[PDB]
Point group: C3
Chain length 114, copies 3
């Protein structure tokens, strides 16, 4: 899995250990081994959500499988929770795009997962 968060929250407001928390919780939620989880946080962005520059986030979670209606609701509760607790972003100012990747369309270690 690969989880990306882009936010207008400043870098100083991202707490120490946040990338590890995300890694841990995503491994648990997706069922994937932690060695396969990648996470990427991009603060200080020039963004608006509903026309407003109050704290917001635009995110993406891509995974080979483990994407679907019920799973994605679960991930959204988890991730909006983390963004609210840690970054002080309202859940209603977060979008998370989910992507179910075919294994042939993910490169890693000089090959793909197919």
């Amino acid at each position: 899995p690969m989880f990306i968060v882009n936010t207008n929250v400043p870098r100083a407001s991202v707490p120490d250990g946040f990338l590890s928390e995300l890694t841990q919780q995503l491994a648990q939620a997706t069922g994937k081994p932690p060695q396969y989880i990648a996470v990427h946080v991009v603060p200080d962005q020039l963004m608006a959500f509903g026309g407003s520059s109050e704290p917001c986030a635009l995110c993406s979670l891509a995974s080979i499988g483990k994407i679907g209606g019920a799973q994605n609701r679960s991930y959204s509760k988890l991730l909006c929770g983390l963004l609210a607790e840690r970054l002080r972003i309202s859940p209603d100012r977060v979008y998370i795009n989910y992507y179910d990747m075919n294994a042939a369309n993910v490169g890693w270690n000089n090959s793909t997962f197919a």
Copy 2:
């Protein structure tokens, strides 16, 4: 809908009010209320387009529906127009990837839009 622009134009060249202009015009084009539109501009990027580093943009518009042949031509005219007028980027140095998201694949407010 969510619109992201990555560009090598410097931050100071992004005019005041541009995120609101994008929000407004995207609301009109997609038909969706502006409260649902998110916009994200990433200046100062290390980029090339066709092997050269004059002003360029790599963008994305992801929406639950409102994506298709005709609509995407319209959006391209609109958005290339804005990028040329406001950021002085030639339309021929802009790519916009369009993504029609399934509602169950967009997280928001602790759940999905399904």
Copy 3:
């Protein structure tokens, strides 16, 4: 085609000429003219791969066609190669997401490619 590299390697560690090299190598690999290749490198990122902040990269290659099982294995060998040689990133800490874009879903020069 458009190739994006997000990495925690510092800006200074990206060699002069790297965007041109990627352009050339991608034009050869995809068979598309260089004028159609766009490349984007984002250093200095806050990222982790398998919980580790050792050098890593999260990448994307989107193209109208020229994507599939065998082609993507080849691209992965190529691009992991380049990232290892030039940025000193282990192939096993690189993900590359491949996107086969429909021509009607790529905007350019006030219209789409359809």
